[PDB]
Amino acid sequence: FGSACFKGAVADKYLSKYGESSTLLANGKWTKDMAKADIVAKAVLDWAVENGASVYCHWFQPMGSSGNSGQVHQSMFNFAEDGTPYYSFTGEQLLQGETDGSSYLSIDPYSPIFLREDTVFIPAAFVSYNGDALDEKTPLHRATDALDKQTKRMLKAMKYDVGSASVYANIGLEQEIFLTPRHAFYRRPDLQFTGRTITGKFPARGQEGAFECMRQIQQECFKMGIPLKTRHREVAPNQYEFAPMFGNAISQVDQNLMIMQVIEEVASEHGLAALLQEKPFAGVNGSGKHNNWSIGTSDGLNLMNPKQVNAKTGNPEIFPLVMAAMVSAVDKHGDLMRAAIASPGNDFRLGAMEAPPAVMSTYLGPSLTEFLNTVKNGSLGEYAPKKKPLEFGSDTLPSIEVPAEDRNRTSPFPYGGNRFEFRAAGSSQNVSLVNTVLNTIAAEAFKIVADRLEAGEKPLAIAQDLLKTHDKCIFNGNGYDPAWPDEAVKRGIWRIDAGCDAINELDSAKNVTLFEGMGIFTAREIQARKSVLLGHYVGSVEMEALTMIDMINQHVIPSVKKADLGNPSKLVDAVKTIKGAVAQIHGTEDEHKAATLARTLRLTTMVAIREIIDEFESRCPPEDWTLATYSELLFF
Amino acid sequence: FGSACFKGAVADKYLSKYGESSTLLANGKWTKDMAKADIVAKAVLDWAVENGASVYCHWFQPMGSSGNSGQVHQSMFNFAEDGTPYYSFTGEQLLQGETDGSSYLSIDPYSPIFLREDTVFIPAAFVSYNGDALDEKTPLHRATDALDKQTKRMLKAMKYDVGSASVYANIGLEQEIFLTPRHAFYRRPDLQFTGRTITGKFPARGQEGAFECMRQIQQECFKMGIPLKTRHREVAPNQYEFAPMFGNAISQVDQNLMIMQVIEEVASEHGLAALLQEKPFAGVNGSGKHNNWSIGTSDGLNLMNPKQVNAKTGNPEIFPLVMAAMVSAVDKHGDLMRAAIASPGNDFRLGAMEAPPAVMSTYLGPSLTEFLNTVKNGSLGEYAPKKKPLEFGSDTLPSIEVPAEDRNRTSPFPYGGNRFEFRAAGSSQNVSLVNTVLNTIAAEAFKIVADRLEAGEKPLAIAQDLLKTHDKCIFNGNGYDPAWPDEAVKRGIWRIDAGCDAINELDSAKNVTLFEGMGIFTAREIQARKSVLLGHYVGSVEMEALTMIDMINQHVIPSVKKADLGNPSKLVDAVKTIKGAVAQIHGTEDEHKAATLARTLRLTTMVAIREIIDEFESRCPPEDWTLATYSELLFF
Amino acid sequence: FGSACFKGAVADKYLSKYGESSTLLANGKWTKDMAKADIVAKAVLDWAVENGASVYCHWFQPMGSSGNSGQVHQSMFNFAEDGTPYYSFTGEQLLQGETDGSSYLSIDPYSPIFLREDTVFIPAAFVSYNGDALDEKTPLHRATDALDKQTKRMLKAMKYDVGSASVYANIGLEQEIFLTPRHAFYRRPDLQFTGRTITGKFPARGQEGAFECMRQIQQECFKMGIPLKTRHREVAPNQYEFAPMFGNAISQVDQNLMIMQVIEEVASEHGLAALLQEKPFAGVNGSGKHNNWSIGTSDGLNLMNPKQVNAKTGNPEIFPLVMAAMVSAVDKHGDLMRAAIASPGNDFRLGAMEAPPAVMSTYLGPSLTEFLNTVKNGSLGEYAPKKKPLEFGSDTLPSIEVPAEDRNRTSPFPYGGNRFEFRAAGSSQNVSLVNTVLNTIAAEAFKIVADRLEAGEKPLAIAQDLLKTHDKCIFNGNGYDPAWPDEAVKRGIWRIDAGCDAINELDSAKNVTLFEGMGIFTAREIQARKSVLLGHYVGSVEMEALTMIDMINQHVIPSVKKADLGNPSKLVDAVKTIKGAVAQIHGTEDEHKAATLARTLRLTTMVAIREIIDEFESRCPPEDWTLATYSELLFF
């Protein structure tokens, strides 16, 4: 409906009062202007006051804030000498904010100013006083700008003009959320403090208003201006996927963050809880958040649509080259993608059956694979996944046409026909970093191909050179095969089984040269980003450890003693071990070393402790088990 | 009413807006057409939008999905550049779906597109990318098509033309459901995870809104477009039978599946739970799902009605031959019928008092039996069950006329006067496989008789030959006699006491030659079907075993310790035994071997453990018995 | 709205009935007049009677009453000989009250007569029969009068006339409140009796209608006419900050007190509890109450705005001189400021990460620091914090302008651009004392500079002399550095780590000479004030100790015995130790000695006992821990 999103027709409704329109809001040049800034400030002031809002808060995502997004509130109504609440909202209040960098928010014109409860949320980019990007919005803006400029350069170098069209990253975010009875949520300290179950015995081994909740979500998103296309269940119990369609990544990351938020408070309203962690329950499918990422222009041109590219430009060579470019990007910076997804929860999703393993190998599909191979051999045609017939052996049943591309779900970066469905991204972790890294690697590849074009090299020769350089990362087989990681390592594809090592790869020489090359970060900027990510991971692991300490000391040991399930001295020794592990975590200074110790702890010591707790729970009566068991959380 | 079923008059209401009618929807040829496909897509879009629906999901039944039916949701309203939810639903969205075959859904035009909540459910057939039938809808379609073509061939070979009339399987599905207090359902993990009580002491040994619930069922089915004829109680406590009348098996299997579903969520709404398992409670009558199966043409001709056949065709010879053919089918493939019913729960229903034993012997009734015997002797007349008088010895009490056929309830395949009431089919198991096997065996016999007719053989001689070949399977006596199985074995009738062996009989040489002969399956197709069925059975037994482990360790052992009912070391030994049995189950590779071990475990070791649990429960106070006992589940 | 505040337009509404207006109420001269007193008495009588009020209570803040404000109720309706409730409210009832000084309230014309429930609260000043100021309102009035007269004198001595304009202290009071479930509040005796948790294990170590509640606060302040500008969450869980804008300190202290009250009852009726203590929870951010203090005239001139001062006066020298004045004040009486904030709860906030440490060092900001240094060197210009550009490296993100002043949050007395955001003030403690000390030190500095001006000394020379005398207290670096306190001590800046010693510094020779010099207190007055403050602190510590005794004897020891967490003899010894400590507290006569013993007890022995209790709680099951743990209070 747009009633709670100052964009498009709703924005124009009040911009026309001052002779303006949503066209001014779309480009974002109004922030540079002075009079337009005050005009839109007055317009949003009205929009809020008859929407039932009185406070405007600048909105931002702090570095490594997976939950999830901070804000600073300010009253937009003042009191004069008479002492009356008269509404007054100027452009300076709209654009500039206040928030400490810590060991002056500025608005994001490309994100829609939206509204919740009685407060208008104004998305903004967060930096330090020095000027360092201390958020995720500014890196994404820099990455998108570099992507746009490099794409324009490479298109112009091959005799194609986009005019004033703006290139960006069109992304859909298939956000998956677990829903749990809030009564059970309050009985699980780990979910309260970490968001994912650090322990709990799954029933039957493990080798397998609720409707009101997402209908309220849908009606909210309607009134919220959010085109939430499809919400539907998933394989895991009470796991619901919301899949808004593609849009500018700058706006879409904020859309995803605010969707996560509104889902959290709606579940709280419905007597439920929205578990956003990547793997909130061990033994079930991980709550992945696929990022359908693609290159999209303002006028709707998509670089993953060869037919659309041929129609709009007339040069068939665009689609293969850029593909190899992205292929090269993966083969150049797959670790960075593994770095992007490296989040506390996501380390429990990589390598499982639901999510692809830690091998960052792209999947172009079979037919596209031999098309690119033929291009590499010196034979460029036109990729066209012609649909083959499919009959069911029954005349009553219709004969359908299905794409020859036998689609794959085992790849971290598969090409889903018309876009890259990067499925490695995690639900809790905001995809902002993922889009930054994807945009910067695409920009690097486009810059390389554009430089080669400007040197006079034929686009063909660039295609063969890049393909023979980076065809190793292309994979089409079953990625879930246990014999795949070592084969990929032999091929040379990026594969980091460790999230700690993945993050530590961020400050590598190649990655740093990339970041200053595209202007995404400085050495200090990338070092601070890596430090923040490592600290976030180690702190999340430490809080999981402390919550486990609290559970054994508070729940598991008392339950064992009450039910007389044997000597709990093993659990006491486990508490000693975990406390010592936290001691070494806090006693080491190297951030990567601390993260490595934390990850080893999480994947080995607390895993064994969790197995011990599950063994003790299986023999524990339901009344004695104070902690809410997986049956109550999942099956309700 | 049809308000939630896009069929008949309701479908015509919106097809007339585009100049069409329900006649287009009936035949199913609209899917082949393009313009008609888009027209019906727009019509169903409108139907849903004022029905209060916004999402369309393709609907299918996976291989061996007894619960029960998967679906994929997609939004039928899109957003343009302005960003408004405008409804747009095309034919391609209507026909094609997305779902992984796994180690491209297509609509079922012969199944009515219906609607639940705010989502329109579109029944569809599920295959693999290769083309293999990975569902139950496609095999049933193939079986029905083979049945129709063979019936047309054999009718034409004896000088009878059906014109454009379509032959199919008219089936009624007497679906029986147990209703339990959902409060007690939550206290029985076996019902939560397996649907049937793996343990629990029945009171008194065993040798013997609720009305709001099925009135809501009835009003739903009215608004849902399902002609649910009769719902009524049964012998067992809270066991309700719903008996929709006969219809095309293609539609009726989906009807039964969605009836199972809607009953489940209605019982959940009413604070109850709908146990659909075959034998949810040991010691009471099993919840069977009789399949009233018959051969029916489009114009209403029924092959089990000799009088109707004589009236419509004028040749009395049709009814005996086909009957003999059907008899031959049983005598040729009774094991396959035993294979069809072979489901996890159904192994607790065969051989009991409520359901017929594991001897797949047909029952034609006495008078029809000697009629067919006389035909076999070379004397064909006209079968006519004349109704004999029945007086009660009182002039006040009316004298009635009752058929001379003393009907039988002890047979798995009795001829209920005008149809085959195959009572061996189970409630939880979808009858789709049962209809596939019945249709394919009927088609095989029909092809045999048609080939004999085309060779010039008189239909008489075929009748005597087939009757003298396959009269052994005919049985009229009491099937519940303990001396019946060995007598049937001596006769040569098919009898598989083991569901595992019944399923393993699917890939037999005769059965495989049948399946490619009628085109129902390929060798790979039938092998995959048998593999899936065996895996489903062994997995259900494995989860019953794991639930037993959790019950003993979590409920039975703590209750014994609390109430001081003696040493529970026997229960610990039982846990060790059942865990070891699961270990051998997971340690063997032969699927039939795994299924045989699982069945032996379930019928012997788990039964002994259940007897031990019942002994411990009889001496356990109700407050100490955490598990809800049969008294609470049945008598409420 | 002002409906519950007899001020401004609402007051004029009924003053016009007698030919008066809110101008009469503003100056406060009406109390001196007789007829005007009766007129306003009748006006407020009406205002109350149709607001639904029948009782008027004189309102005052007793010495050291942090909660919070006493009142005396009296009926304003009488009964004549007929016996009818006729409303009669005279000026004598309005002005004079009754309340014992103890070992004759008079109205505060500069505070708005306001209304709550069915009682009109009339703010008033509380003294003794002798005439000694036994409240905080009268000291604040004296301090403001001295500030105004000295400011007028020093402005006139440098050729600037303010006419009839009145100078005062414009303050904002960022009051922070913790919100706790009242169910948990009733389970924490320490919160009931002391307002802050004396014990309780914080989850995860510690190294990190609710919306209806503050919306009701906001609508109350509207209908009450309190311009509560911004209410918003804070870093700590359920910590809400309310930040009314600047106003006359005399009125604003009453505003803060009544806001505290109304928040308390609103939380109470919301099923919650408003913890106003400075550090209600150890391990989280302290609930500070920042006092944004500045010098403001009646006509709106602010002494902290150099541009406004230059515009209104034309003499740039005003802003630097006065600044040095306040700087001198701090360097002269920082201990007094440390004395002002010295409250029972506030001793748990100084030295932590959230609040600045015990070093009372002002922060003028870097650029202002070198501006004042250059002035001290003999070079006076015009301070102007030019805003430097700030770009995010992205053309999409706007380029903003941010002041060159890198703002600091680690200082107790930072100059927040246009005011002094004295953050050391505590939430529970009323800022009345803080404003008294700030006003009197400002008045002393202004009197000194005015005397030097009247002696003929150039304002410049006074600037250099004062700056070279008192530049040591100026600090711009990180105040949270552990190496800062000793550096400040070597510099000579005031630093009192002990609240007891801070209060004992009140009766120092310099402080006493200040207090009679500005007329704020006499020797008896200041001695009584120090005695009351020390007694308040020691009594709060004593009741915390007694509550601790009750917690161990009533909760901790029984919980340990029930859960069998080892020998509780350590807790018995702790009870003996704390009882003995209270014994020495009650056995000593020197008030400062008693306060020092109390502070030592609270910071060492009670802290160790709290650590022991937290250790026992970590191993105690939640059901055994009768006391509500931090998880329940904070996360709800």
Strand-helix topology:
This is part of a larger assembly, with 3 copies of chain A (636 residues).
Chain A: E1 5-6, H1 8-15, H2 22-27, H3 35-51, E2 55-60, E3 70-75, E4 77-79, E5 85-87, H4 91-95, E6 106-107, E7 113-116, E8 119-125, H5 137-157, E9 167-181, H6 182-185, H7 189-193, H8 211-224, E10 230-233, E11 239-243, E12 247-248, H9 249-269, E13 272-275, E14 290-297, H10 306-313, H11 318-341, E15 362-363, H12 366-377, E16 387-390, E17 400-403, E18 413-414, E19 420-422, H13 432-454, H14 459-470, H15 484-491, H16 499-504, H17 509-517, H18 523-563, H19 569-587, H20 591-618, H21 630-634
Parallel strand pairs in A: 2-8, 15-18
Antiparallel strand pairs in A: 1-7, 2-3, 4-5, 6-8, 7-8, 9-11, 9-12, 9-13, 9-14, 10-11, 14-19, 16-17
Describe the structure.
The structure is cut from a larger assembly and holds three copies of chain A (636 residues). In chain A, helix 8 (211-224) crosses helix 9 (249-269), helix 11 packs parallel to helix 14 (459-470) and helix 18 packs antiparallel against helix 19 (569-587). The first copy, chain A, has 21 helices and 19 strands. In chain A, strands 9, 10, 11, 12, 13, 14 and 19 form a seven-stranded antiparallel beta sheet that branches. In chain A, strands 1, 2, 3, 6, 7 and 8 form a six-stranded mixed beta sheet that branches. Helices cover 47% and strands 14% of the residues of chain A. Chain A has helices at residues 8-15, 22-27, 35-51, 91-95, 137-157, 182-185, 189-193, 211-224, 249-269, 306-313, 318-341, 366-377, 432-454, 459-470, 484-491, 499-504, 509-517, 523-563, 569-587, 591-618, 630-634, and strands at 5-6, 55-60, 70-75, 77-79, 85-87, 106-107, 113-116, 119-125, 167-181, 230-233, 239-243, 247-248, 272-275, 290-297, 362-363, 387-390, 400-403, 413-414, 420-422. With 636 residues, chain A is α+β, with helices and mostly antiparallel strands. Chains in contact: A-B, A-C. Chains A, B, C: One of its GO terms (molecular function) is glutamine synthetase activity. Chains A, B, C: Pfam families: Gln-synt_C, Gln-synt_C-ter, GSIII_N. Chains A, B, C: This is Glutamine synthetase type III N terminal-domain-containing protein. Chains A, B, C: Belongs to the glutamine synthetase family. Chains A, B, C: Residues 136-556 form the GS catalytic domain.
